[PDB]
Amino acid sequence: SGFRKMAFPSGKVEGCMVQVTCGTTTLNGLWLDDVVYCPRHVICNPNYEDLLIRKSNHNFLVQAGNVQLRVIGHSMQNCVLKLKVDTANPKTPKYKFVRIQPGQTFSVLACYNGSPSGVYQCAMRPNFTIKGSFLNGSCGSVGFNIDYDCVSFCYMHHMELPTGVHAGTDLAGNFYGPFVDRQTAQAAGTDTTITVNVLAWLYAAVINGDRWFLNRFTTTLNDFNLVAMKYNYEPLTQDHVDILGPLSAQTGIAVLDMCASLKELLQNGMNGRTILGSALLEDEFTPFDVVRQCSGVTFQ
Amino acid sequence: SGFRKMAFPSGKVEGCMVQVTCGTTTLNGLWLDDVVYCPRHVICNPNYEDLLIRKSNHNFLVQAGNVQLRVIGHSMQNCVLKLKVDTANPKTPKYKFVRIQPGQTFSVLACYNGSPSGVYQCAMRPNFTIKGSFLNGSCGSVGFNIDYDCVSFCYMHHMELPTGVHAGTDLAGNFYGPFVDRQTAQAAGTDTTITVNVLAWLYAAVINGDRWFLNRFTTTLNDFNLVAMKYNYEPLTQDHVDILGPLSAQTGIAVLDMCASLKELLQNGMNGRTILGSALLEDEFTPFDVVRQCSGVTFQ
Ligand SMILES: *[C@](O)(C(N)=O)[C@H](C[C@@H]1CCNC1=O)NC(=O)[C@@H]1[C@@H]2[C@H](CN1C(=O)[C@@H](NC(=O)NC(C)(C)C)C(C)(C)C)C2(C)C
Ligand SMILES: *[C@](O)(C(N)=O)[C@H](C[C@@H]1CCNC1=O)NC(=O)[C@@H]1[C@@H]2[C@H](CN1C(=O)[C@@H](NC(=O)NC(C)(C)C)C(C)(C)C)C2(C)C
C-alpha cells in the first residue's frame, strides 16, 4: 500500500536525449531513429520560415554524450525542428507521438545540455499549461507515458509564462493551448480543477484505508456539477463516470456517492485533516494512474 | 522556475533489476557485476541461517528479462542474500552502497517481477520508516541517489508496517530502524517532522517567488527549538544551520530569520494559503535537493 505521485521509469527516454546547439542557443533534442526533434526557437516577432531558409546543416551542432552527430537535412513541422542525422539512435525505443487531452498526466524528464536532471509527474491543466520545474536550458525536455513497452511522447517544453507555469507542444510541434513561440503578451487563462482526477484520487484514498471523508449521501450528476462550477471544478460528464467504473467496482462506492463526498469536502473543507498526506484535493492522478499504482502494472 | 518532487532518472537502475524466484516466492533483485542482491526472506520466527544451509544454488531462479541467470554461489549478509551468478551485468553502472541518515531523501524504483513500474522520491523518516508505494511483489526494489555518474544505492524494500509505511535495509542488509524480517509485533515509532528539510523547502518557495510567509522577525536557535518540540519537529542543530547557508546566501534570508517564519507558520497555520502548491509544510526536500532543482544540476 501507499500512494505516491509516481513517474514512469525514464530509461527509455534518457537513451534519446541529445544536446542541440545553434549559434548562441543550446537546448535539448529528442533523437529517435535518424531524426532529432527540438524546439524551432533554437534557430538564429520572428519569422521562423525566413530564419530557417537562412541556416545551413553545419550550423546545427548535435551532441549525443561525447559523440557529435552530423546533420544531413532539416525541416520544420509547426513549432518543432526535425534535424535529419546520419546515424540512427541504437537506443530508439518503441514509440508513438500522441497529442493528449487536458486532464491527462505524463512524466517529464527534465534535461539540461542533453543530460537528464530529474523525472517527475505532471498533468496537462485544463488551461493547457503544465506546472513543471524548468530552468533555462530545459527546452526540448519531453513528457511521456509508457504503455507496456511503448513510449508515447506527448510534450516537448518550449517556454515559461509569467505566472511560473509552462507551455509547450506535442512532438509534432503543435502548442497545447493558445500559446505561440513569440516573446509577445500571453496569459495562461483561468485554470480549473480536474474533477474526474480528484474523484480518482479519493478512490485511491479508500483503496489505501482513508475513509474519513465518505458520507452516507448521494447526488445526481446535475446537482454535483452545480456545486462543481461554484468551486471552479471541471464539469463531470457521464463519460467520466463510466471511466471511474472500475474504481467504483473495486471499492464498492458508487461514482455518484463519491461525488457526494467530494461535494461535502468542497463545502466544508478538510477541517484539519489530510487525505493521502495532502491537505488539498489532488487532481493530477487520472483514473488509470490510480489503477496502475494500486494494482501494480509494470512496463518493459 | 517551478518546484516539483523530483526523482533521479532511473535508467541506470532499471538496467540492474532482475526477478528472483525461490520455491513459491518471487521478488526483485539487484544485479551488479556478477552478484544479485535480494531480501533474504525469498528463501523457503524463522532461522535464516538454517533455512539457507538447506537450499541449493539451483533452487534460485534468477530471470533478467528473457535470459535466465545461473547461480553459482550464495551467501547471506545480514538480511540480504547475495547470489553469485556466472554472468556480470554489462549494464552495471558506477555505484556505491551507502547507509543514509534519517532526513535524507532518495528515489525509489518500484518493481514487480523484475520489471520497473514507477519512480518516486522518498525520505527516510526520523523513525526509520519510509512512506512508499509498495504492493506485494515489490520486495527487492531499491532506493538510490545519483551523484554525477555514480549510483549510490541506499535502500532495499522488505516489508510493510501495519500503519501502511514501509521498512527495509541498506544494500548490506542492515535494517533501517529497529525492524526485523520476522512476522512479529513491530510498530514504527512516533514520527517527527524533518525541520531542516522544511526550512530548505521554504527557501525553495522564496527562490520561486512565494514570499507571503516571511516576516520581519528573527529567533535564536534555542527559542526556535523550544517551538519545534511542541509541534513534533526534529531539533535544528547548528550543523543544520550551516547546511542551509548557501540557500540563505542566495535568497538573502538569514537562516534564523527563516526559522522565525517557520515558527509563525507553526503557530498560526497557513490560513487558507499554499506554499509551492502544498497546504502542508513539506519535509521531504533536503537542502541539497533544493539546490539541485533550483540551479539545474544534471547527471550522466
Ligand atoms: C528554452 O528556450 C531553453 N533554452 O531552455 C527556454 C525555457 C524557459 C527559460 C526559463 N524557464 C523556461 O521554461 N524558453 C524560452 O526562453 C522561451 C523562448 C523565448 C522566450 N521564452 C520564454 O520562456 C520566456 N517567456 C516569455 O517570454 N513569456 C511570454 C512573455 C511570451 C508570456 C522567458 C522570459 C525567457 C521565461 C521563446 C521563443 C518564447
Ligand atoms: C515482499 O516480500 C514482496 N514479496 O514484495 C513483501 C512486500 C510487502 C507486501 C505488501 N506490501 C509490502 O511492502 N514483504 C513481505 O511480505 C514481508 C515479509 C514477511 C511479511 N511481510 C510483510 O510486509 C507483512 N508485514 C508484517 O508482517 N508486518 C509486521 C507484523 C511484522 C509489522 C505483510 C503483512 C505481508 C504486509 C516478512 C518476512 C516481514
XYZ file of C-alpha atoms and ligand atoms in Angstrom:
678
model
C 0.000 0.000 0.000
C 0.794 3.709 -0.003
C 0.164 6.219 -2.755
C 2.822 8.387 -4.316
C 2.953 10.803 -7.216
C 4.807 8.338 -9.386
C 6.576 8.872 -12.707
C 7.273 6.296 -15.366
C 10.773 4.782 -15.345
C 12.765 7.150 -17.539
C 15.443 4.871 -19.015
C 13.856 4.502 -22.440
C 13.761 8.312 -22.798
C 17.200 9.001 -21.295
C 18.633 6.996 -24.189
C 17.134 9.537 -26.615
C 18.251 12.876 -25.166
C 20.821 14.917 -27.051
C 22.191 18.442 -26.996
C 21.393 20.768 -29.899
C 23.442 23.950 -30.252
C 22.810 26.600 -32.938
C 24.585 29.946 -32.743
C 24.407 31.068 -29.117
C 21.461 28.821 -28.182
C 21.869 25.403 -26.581
C 18.902 23.216 -25.686
C 17.793 19.587 -25.732
C 16.641 17.387 -28.560
C 14.958 14.006 -28.830
C 16.878 11.525 -31.000
C 14.633 8.783 -32.440
C 15.895 6.700 -35.372
C 17.827 9.195 -37.566
C 15.861 12.318 -36.560
C 16.442 14.783 -33.728
C 13.381 16.757 -32.612
C 13.877 20.080 -30.875
C 12.057 23.405 -30.444
C 12.220 25.581 -33.596
C 13.308 28.594 -31.425
C 16.940 27.200 -31.314
C 17.458 28.791 -34.806
C 19.117 32.262 -35.073
C 8.024 38.672 -33.802
C 10.362 36.255 -35.503
C 9.532 34.665 -38.883
C 10.906 31.162 -38.475
C 10.407 30.237 -42.133
C 12.791 33.081 -43.097
C 15.151 32.295 -40.262
C 15.355 28.634 -41.268
C 15.857 29.184 -45.013
C 18.972 31.149 -43.940
C 20.592 28.369 -41.846
C 22.812 25.505 -43.068
C 23.048 21.900 -41.846
C 26.517 22.579 -40.446
C 25.065 25.347 -38.258
C 23.373 22.656 -36.110
C 25.719 21.019 -33.612
C 24.083 17.876 -32.183
C 25.934 16.210 -29.298
C 25.000 12.755 -28.008
C 27.265 12.479 -24.984
C 30.801 12.563 -26.378
C 29.783 11.664 -29.930
C 28.979 14.525 -32.275
C 26.089 13.958 -34.630
C 26.224 15.294 -38.188
C 23.032 16.860 -39.541
C 22.264 15.907 -43.148
C 18.930 17.677 -43.523
C 16.438 19.767 -41.654
C 12.773 20.636 -41.800
C 10.288 22.490 -39.670
C 6.953 20.978 -38.633
C 4.848 23.585 -36.831
C 6.971 24.726 -33.864
C 9.452 21.819 -33.841
C 12.591 21.427 -35.885
C 13.462 17.986 -37.260
C 17.188 17.508 -37.824
C 17.985 14.538 -40.070
C 21.230 12.965 -38.825
C 23.458 10.363 -40.455
C 23.144 7.914 -37.529
C 20.049 6.129 -36.251
C 19.767 6.074 -32.470
C 20.501 2.446 -31.463
C 18.647 3.072 -28.202
C 15.454 4.125 -30.009
C 12.537 2.529 -28.115
C 9.180 1.556 -29.486
C 7.389 4.860 -29.531
C 4.404 6.893 -30.663
C 3.694 10.610 -30.774
C 0.372 11.405 -29.078
C -1.462 14.659 -28.523
C -3.066 14.385 -25.082
C -6.269 15.952 -23.745
C -6.297 18.320 -20.773
C -6.546 16.322 -17.566
C -4.187 13.618 -18.835
C -0.975 13.074 -16.893
C 2.538 12.340 -18.078
C 6.082 12.059 -16.827
C 8.587 14.820 -17.590
C 12.275 14.041 -17.955
C 13.877 17.394 -17.178
C 17.146 17.848 -19.082
C 19.997 20.327 -19.468
C 22.703 20.153 -22.146
C 21.291 16.810 -23.257
C 21.735 15.295 -19.771
C 18.757 14.101 -17.681
C 18.378 16.013 -14.406
C 15.221 14.509 -12.902
C 11.880 12.904 -13.562
C 8.500 13.982 -12.256
C 4.799 13.600 -12.926
C 2.669 16.413 -14.450
C -0.858 16.928 -15.676
C -1.919 18.914 -18.699
C -4.024 21.571 -16.996
C -7.456 22.492 -18.364
C -5.898 25.804 -19.492
C -3.216 23.846 -21.405
C -0.307 24.857 -19.204
C 1.702 22.458 -17.100
C 3.029 23.203 -13.621
C 6.536 21.973 -14.316
C 10.009 22.559 -12.968
C 12.033 24.110 -15.798
C 15.115 26.345 -15.691
C 16.866 27.952 -18.628
C 18.324 25.192 -20.774
C 15.413 22.809 -20.224
C 13.746 23.457 -23.604
C 13.396 20.266 -25.594
C 12.810 18.173 -22.471
C 9.906 15.845 -23.217
C 6.870 14.487 -21.420
C 5.749 10.926 -21.986
C 3.751 7.906 -20.924
C 4.843 4.291 -21.268
C 2.375 1.571 -22.285
C 3.945 -1.842 -21.670
C 6.983 -1.427 -23.942
C 5.994 1.649 -25.955
C 6.948 5.244 -25.129
C 4.139 7.665 -26.037
C 5.728 11.114 -26.290
C 3.189 13.840 -25.642
C 5.016 17.044 -24.691
C 8.117 18.986 -25.516
C 8.984 22.020 -23.435
C 9.243 25.489 -25.058
C 8.564 28.367 -22.694
C 7.523 29.735 -19.321
C 4.546 32.026 -18.690
C 4.785 34.959 -16.265
C 2.778 33.061 -13.627
C 5.589 30.482 -13.418
C 3.748 27.775 -15.361
C 4.919 26.226 -18.586
C 3.805 25.815 -22.168
C 4.947 23.527 -24.922
C 3.957 21.437 -27.895
C 3.204 17.893 -28.843
C 6.048 16.163 -30.663
C 4.592 17.340 -33.981
C 5.202 20.908 -32.770
C 1.606 21.994 -32.158
C 1.295 24.029 -28.993
C -1.046 22.954 -26.307
C -3.381 25.914 -25.801
C -3.360 29.317 -27.500
C 0.355 29.900 -26.951
C 2.894 30.841 -29.613
C 6.703 30.754 -29.549
C 6.939 34.550 -29.690
C 8.056 36.962 -26.982
C 4.630 38.629 -27.020
C 1.987 39.226 -24.373
C 0.413 35.890 -23.474
C -1.512 34.843 -20.379
C -2.341 31.315 -19.303
C -6.077 31.630 -18.882
C -8.141 30.799 -15.805
C -7.382 27.278 -14.668
C -9.881 24.809 -13.230
C -9.571 21.672 -11.125
C -9.706 18.304 -12.910
C -12.812 16.835 -11.271
C -12.580 13.281 -12.594
C -8.981 13.144 -11.308
C -9.962 14.352 -7.830
C -12.553 11.578 -7.678
C -9.986 9.011 -8.843
C -7.650 10.127 -6.050
C -10.432 9.838 -3.483
C -10.853 6.239 -4.661
C -7.093 5.792 -4.267
C -7.515 7.030 -0.702
C -10.223 4.448 0.019
C -8.162 1.634 -1.532
C -5.390 2.675 0.866
C -7.522 2.848 4.038
C -8.531 6.535 4.135
C -12.298 6.659 4.602
C -12.977 9.659 6.863
C -14.380 11.836 4.035
C -17.047 9.334 2.955
C -20.680 10.011 3.804
C -23.971 8.177 3.553
C -25.235 10.638 0.932
C -25.595 10.630 -2.832
C -26.085 13.211 -5.570
C -27.203 13.408 -9.165
C -24.685 14.308 -11.854
C -26.636 17.530 -12.339
C -26.604 18.649 -8.693
C -22.937 17.717 -8.359
C -21.993 19.769 -11.406
C -23.930 22.701 -9.946
C -21.579 22.554 -6.948
C -18.537 21.885 -9.148
C -18.887 25.162 -11.038
C -19.035 27.310 -7.928
C -15.699 25.839 -6.838
C -14.056 26.165 -10.280
C -14.109 22.425 -10.989
C -14.375 20.988 -14.491
C -17.807 19.577 -15.372
C -18.081 15.853 -14.683
C -19.539 14.015 -17.686
C -21.197 10.628 -17.922
C -18.061 9.511 -19.778
C -16.018 10.481 -16.701
C -18.451 8.450 -14.578
C -18.001 5.455 -16.889
C -14.197 5.800 -16.657
C -14.483 5.755 -12.843
C -16.426 2.477 -13.096
C -13.610 0.037 -12.259
C -12.515 2.043 -9.193
C -16.153 2.201 -8.096
C -16.413 -1.563 -8.599
C -13.244 -2.345 -6.644
C -14.204 -0.144 -3.674
C -17.968 -0.696 -3.670
C -18.583 3.076 -3.699
C -20.914 4.274 -6.454
C -19.378 7.073 -8.506
C -22.307 9.306 -7.613
C -21.717 8.555 -3.921
C -18.075 9.573 -4.201
C -19.367 12.742 -5.856
C -21.478 13.423 -2.759
C -18.331 13.024 -0.672
C -16.438 15.486 -2.881
C -19.360 17.904 -2.613
C -19.094 17.826 1.187
C -15.302 18.297 1.024
C -15.757 21.299 -1.268
C -18.340 22.851 1.027
C -16.734 22.142 4.414
C -13.077 21.927 3.522
C -10.933 19.224 5.011
C -11.018 20.719 8.558
C -7.504 19.945 9.775
C -7.321 16.531 8.133
C -5.273 15.047 5.313
C -6.049 12.617 2.509
C -3.095 10.556 1.302
C -0.781 13.008 3.039
C -2.269 16.039 1.267
C -4.191 18.917 2.832
C -5.521 19.829 -0.640
C -7.752 17.959 -3.071
C -5.277 16.434 -5.522
C -6.117 16.416 -9.223
C -3.006 15.147 -11.052
C -3.876 11.416 -10.841
C -6.070 10.046 -13.611
C -8.320 7.047 -13.011
C -5.785 4.999 -14.933
C -2.924 6.298 -12.760
C -4.796 5.118 -9.677
C -5.421 1.644 -11.133
C -1.765 1.340 -12.258
C -0.421 2.263 -8.865
C -2.991 0.330 -6.801
C -2.782 -2.907 -8.879
C 0.926 -2.989 -9.772
C 1.211 -2.732 -13.571
C 4.792 -2.885 -14.893
C 6.489 -1.853 -18.142
C 9.221 -3.316 -20.334
C 11.064 28.027 -12.324
C 8.587 25.752 -10.571
C 9.282 23.187 -7.887
C 8.359 19.540 -8.129
C 9.003 16.464 -6.035
C 11.575 15.160 -8.463
C 13.203 11.732 -8.673
C 16.538 10.874 -10.202
C 16.437 9.494 -13.756
C 16.053 5.756 -13.232
C 17.762 4.299 -16.315
C 20.979 3.280 -14.584
C 18.957 1.272 -12.027
C 16.439 -0.200 -14.486
C 19.389 -1.929 -16.147
C 20.074 -3.776 -12.874
C 16.652 -5.152 -11.928
C 16.072 -8.888 -12.111
C 13.497 -11.387 -10.914
C 14.464 -13.857 -8.187
C 12.205 -16.860 -7.616
C 12.767 -19.451 -4.858
C 10.082 -22.021 -4.106
C 6.765 -20.167 -4.101
C 8.282 -16.703 -3.551
C 9.055 -14.291 -6.379
C 10.571 -10.868 -5.767
C 13.128 -8.471 -7.224
C 16.889 -8.494 -7.108
C 19.625 -6.010 -7.932
C 22.189 -7.347 -10.421
C 25.565 -5.568 -10.157
C 28.640 -7.179 -11.731
C 28.195 -10.942 -11.084
C 26.118 -10.621 -7.888
C 22.356 -10.377 -7.414
C 21.209 -8.767 -4.158
C 17.762 -9.577 -2.828
C 15.946 -9.805 0.519
C 16.913 -12.943 2.497
C 13.163 -13.689 3.092
C 12.885 -15.151 -0.504
C 14.357 -18.438 0.920
C 11.971 -21.289 1.942
C 10.321 -16.846 13.912
C 12.377 -18.172 11.047
C 16.086 -19.033 11.437
C 17.516 -17.919 8.114
C 20.931 -19.477 8.743
C 19.234 -22.907 8.993
C 16.934 -22.172 6.096
C 19.844 -21.162 3.866
C 22.140 -24.095 4.703
C 19.258 -26.259 3.388
C 18.929 -24.579 -0.048
C 20.937 -25.316 -3.218
C 22.153 -22.947 -5.949
C 19.707 -24.498 -8.413
C 16.822 -23.572 -6.095
C 17.351 -19.890 -7.033
C 15.821 -18.948 -10.379
C 17.141 -15.535 -11.479
C 15.483 -14.035 -14.566
C 16.893 -10.985 -16.351
C 14.171 -10.319 -18.899
C 14.138 -13.386 -21.145
C 17.607 -14.576 -20.140
C 17.838 -16.949 -17.199
C 20.757 -16.406 -14.874
C 22.543 -19.378 -13.313
C 23.510 -19.049 -9.648
C 26.982 -20.399 -8.850
C 27.141 -19.466 -5.177
C 25.203 -17.782 -2.443
C 25.835 -16.068 0.855
C 23.845 -14.110 3.376
C 24.952 -10.701 4.654
C 22.638 -9.544 7.443
C 19.138 -9.512 5.907
C 20.174 -9.601 2.230
C 21.025 -12.608 0.127
C 23.884 -12.343 -2.373
C 23.522 -14.730 -5.304
C 26.761 -15.198 -7.253
C 25.863 -15.623 -10.936
C 28.010 -16.748 -13.853
C 27.420 -13.528 -15.840
C 28.446 -9.981 -14.966
C 25.758 -7.397 -15.662
C 27.005 -5.456 -18.727
C 24.741 -2.574 -17.709
C 26.357 -2.285 -14.264
C 26.760 1.452 -13.546
C 29.330 3.096 -11.357
C 27.871 2.560 -7.935
C 28.332 2.676 -4.179
C 26.360 1.242 -1.283
C 25.575 3.947 1.289
C 23.714 3.839 4.574
C 21.792 7.117 4.797
C 20.769 9.149 7.851
C 17.137 9.898 8.682
C 16.046 13.037 6.868
C 17.951 12.109 3.706
C 15.921 11.647 0.536
C 16.236 9.121 -2.257
C 14.462 7.894 -5.348
C 12.632 4.558 -5.286
C 12.317 2.464 -8.425
C 9.246 0.363 -7.676
C 9.442 -3.043 -9.373
C 7.404 -6.215 -9.832
C 8.718 -9.464 -11.330
C 11.976 -7.693 -12.138
C 10.186 -5.032 -14.225
C 10.217 -1.328 -13.253
C 6.739 0.045 -12.520
C 7.443 3.638 -11.476
C 9.866 6.025 -9.861
C 9.214 8.381 -6.978
C 11.005 10.390 -4.323
C 11.037 9.364 -0.619
C 12.645 10.483 2.602
C 13.983 8.261 5.337
C 11.713 9.331 8.180
C 13.152 10.107 11.619
C 11.529 6.851 12.814
C 13.365 4.959 10.032
C 10.286 4.094 8.008
C 9.607 5.360 4.522
C 6.196 6.390 3.208
C 6.452 4.415 -0.006
C 4.100 2.875 -2.520
C 4.675 -0.890 -2.390
C 2.353 -3.772 -3.288
C 3.051 -7.464 -2.894
C 5.898 -8.372 -5.222
C 7.774 -5.106 -4.695
C 10.362 -6.540 -2.273
C 13.875 -6.042 -3.570
C 13.000 -2.705 -5.176
C 15.800 -0.288 -4.321
C 16.165 3.345 -3.342
C 19.068 5.387 -4.628
C 20.689 8.729 -5.298
C 22.825 9.594 -8.310
C 25.939 11.765 -7.963
C 27.105 12.848 -11.421
C 27.664 9.368 -12.887
C 27.571 7.213 -9.750
C 24.503 5.420 -8.379
C 24.511 5.383 -4.561
C 22.149 2.594 -3.504
C 20.742 3.228 -0.052
C 17.568 1.172 0.397
C 16.109 -2.169 -0.484
C 12.476 -2.848 0.308
C 11.498 -5.704 2.679
C 8.194 -5.190 4.454
C 5.163 -3.089 5.312
C 4.159 -1.989 8.818
C 0.513 -2.021 9.933
C 0.287 1.779 9.615
C 0.892 1.449 5.858
C 4.503 2.648 5.961
C 7.496 0.650 4.858
C 10.719 -0.736 6.248
C 13.822 -2.063 4.593
C 17.578 -2.328 4.692
C 20.648 -0.758 3.231
C 22.231 -2.798 0.452
C 24.392 -4.576 3.036
C 21.154 -5.904 4.558
C 21.073 -3.859 7.766
C 17.582 -2.656 8.552
C 16.916 0.980 8.990
C 15.414 1.288 12.471
C 14.600 -1.439 14.994
C 12.773 -3.631 12.483
C 13.445 -7.306 11.808
C 12.358 -9.537 8.917
C 10.089 -11.602 11.169
C 6.297 -11.736 11.241
C 6.297 -10.485 14.839
C 4.732 -7.498 16.564
C 6.543 -4.364 15.419
C 5.438 -0.737 15.473
C 7.021 2.149 13.612
C 7.591 4.531 16.483
C 6.408 8.127 16.779
C 7.486 10.084 13.734
C 8.637 13.701 13.696
C 8.894 16.356 11.002
C 12.299 16.937 9.388
C 12.869 20.567 10.385
C 15.941 21.306 8.275
C 14.038 19.999 5.226
C 11.009 22.205 5.915
C 13.326 25.215 6.049
C 15.011 24.160 2.796
C 11.593 23.965 1.127
C 10.665 27.413 2.414
C 13.844 28.664 0.727
C 12.744 26.845 -2.432
C 9.473 28.753 -2.159
C 11.284 32.099 -1.948
C 13.549 31.227 -4.893
C 10.346 30.555 -6.842
C 8.502 33.767 -5.883
C 6.481 32.660 -2.832
C 7.141 35.183 -0.070
C 3.839 35.574 1.806
C 5.016 33.590 4.870
C 8.100 35.737 5.515
C 8.103 38.151 8.439
C 10.347 40.877 9.777
C 11.157 38.802 12.870
C 14.053 36.650 13.998
C 14.656 33.974 16.620
C 17.520 32.288 18.400
C 18.244 28.628 17.721
C 17.207 27.952 21.311
C 13.816 29.692 21.154
C 13.082 28.126 17.772
C 13.823 24.640 19.069
C 11.516 25.321 22.018
C 8.710 25.856 19.493
C 9.873 22.944 17.324
C 9.384 20.382 20.086
C 5.818 21.397 20.836
C 4.946 20.769 17.185
C 6.827 17.443 16.966
C 9.638 18.833 14.808
C 13.182 17.479 14.905
C 15.676 19.688 16.760
C 17.506 22.087 14.454
C 21.265 21.965 15.066
C 23.972 24.458 14.211
C 25.126 21.922 11.610
C 21.671 22.155 10.001
C 22.030 25.952 10.033
C 25.431 25.667 8.342
C 23.958 23.337 5.688
C 21.242 25.940 4.993
C 23.977 28.542 4.423
C 24.030 28.538 0.604
C 20.227 28.840 0.353
C 20.361 31.664 2.895
C 23.095 33.322 0.829
C 21.212 33.009 -2.463
C 17.950 34.403 -1.046
C 19.363 36.958 1.393
C 17.270 35.492 4.236
C 19.254 34.591 7.353
C 18.634 31.012 8.453
C 17.456 32.276 11.827
C 15.008 34.609 10.066
C 13.551 31.730 8.075
C 13.224 29.941 11.412
C 11.122 32.847 12.693
C 8.915 32.446 9.630
C 8.513 28.713 10.289
C 7.685 29.490 13.918
C 4.841 31.764 12.797
C 3.587 29.130 10.322
C 3.593 26.511 13.081
C 1.691 28.779 15.446
C -0.848 30.283 13.029
C -1.107 27.603 10.389
C -1.184 28.546 6.753
C -4.695 30.113 6.943
C -6.135 29.121 3.571
C -2.898 29.622 1.659
C -0.495 27.316 -0.146
C 3.281 27.192 -0.459
C 4.578 25.631 -3.670
C 1.138 24.138 -4.237
C 1.037 22.460 -0.814
C -1.318 23.225 2.066
C 1.082 21.402 4.426
C 4.659 22.125 5.458
C 6.690 19.812 3.226
C 9.685 17.996 4.689
C 10.918 15.565 2.004
C 13.276 18.028 0.247
C 16.791 18.274 1.645
C 18.812 21.467 1.281
C 20.753 19.703 -1.447
C 17.532 18.710 -3.247
C 16.502 22.362 -3.315
C 19.870 23.500 -4.707
C 19.839 20.717 -7.350
C 16.379 21.596 -8.544
C 16.761 25.392 -8.335
C 20.206 25.517 -10.054
C 19.854 22.742 -12.647
C 22.430 20.048 -11.822
C 22.474 17.113 -14.267
C 23.768 13.533 -14.126
C 25.496 11.198 -16.567
C 14.181 27.414 -23.520
O 14.369 28.083 -24.776
C 15.521 26.902 -23.053
N 16.692 27.319 -23.743
O 15.569 26.138 -22.104
C 13.509 28.371 -22.534
C 12.958 27.690 -21.268
C 12.432 28.721 -20.261
C 13.547 29.542 -19.614
C 13.090 29.752 -18.171
N 12.092 28.719 -17.945
C 11.715 28.126 -19.074
O 10.886 27.237 -19.162
N 12.417 29.009 -23.261
C 12.479 30.288 -23.619
O 13.432 31.004 -23.356
C 11.302 30.858 -24.355
C 11.699 31.178 -25.799
C 11.654 32.691 -25.957
C 11.286 33.278 -24.593
N 10.984 32.132 -23.733
C 10.472 32.140 -22.504
O 10.136 31.125 -21.921
C 10.283 33.478 -21.872
N 8.888 33.621 -21.526
C 8.156 34.531 -22.171
O 8.700 35.330 -22.935
N 6.840 34.519 -21.930
C 5.838 35.352 -22.600
C 6.124 36.831 -22.391
C 5.805 35.036 -24.095
C 4.498 35.015 -21.954
C 11.227 33.753 -20.691
C 11.098 35.210 -20.262
C 12.666 33.527 -21.162
C 10.938 32.877 -19.477
C 10.593 31.815 -26.645
C 10.747 31.873 -28.173
C 9.164 32.008 -26.122
C 7.772 -8.662 -0.119
O 8.243 -9.891 0.453
C 7.352 -8.933 -1.542
N 7.275 -10.281 -1.988
O 7.100 -7.994 -2.278
C 6.653 -8.093 0.756
C 6.287 -6.631 0.443
C 5.067 -6.174 1.252
C 3.769 -6.839 0.795
C 2.703 -5.753 0.933
N 3.449 -4.505 0.969
C 4.754 -4.702 1.135
O 5.597 -3.826 1.207
N 7.118 -8.197 2.135
C 6.589 -9.077 2.979
O 5.686 -9.836 2.664
C 7.126 -9.103 4.379
C 7.887 -10.410 4.620
C 7.099 -11.213 5.644
C 5.838 -10.412 5.973
N 5.983 -9.132 5.275
C 5.215 -8.050 5.377
O 5.495 -6.988 4.852
C 3.988 -8.182 6.216
N 4.045 -7.186 7.261
C 4.180 -7.588 8.525
O 4.105 -8.786 8.802
N 4.387 -6.631 9.438
C 4.665 -6.847 10.859
C 3.530 -7.603 11.533
C 5.974 -7.618 11.028
C 4.776 -5.463 11.491
C 2.675 -8.143 5.419
C 1.509 -8.497 6.335
C 2.748 -9.205 4.318
C 2.391 -6.778 4.800
C 8.445 -10.579 6.036
C 9.498 -11.665 6.310
C 8.350 -9.475 7.096
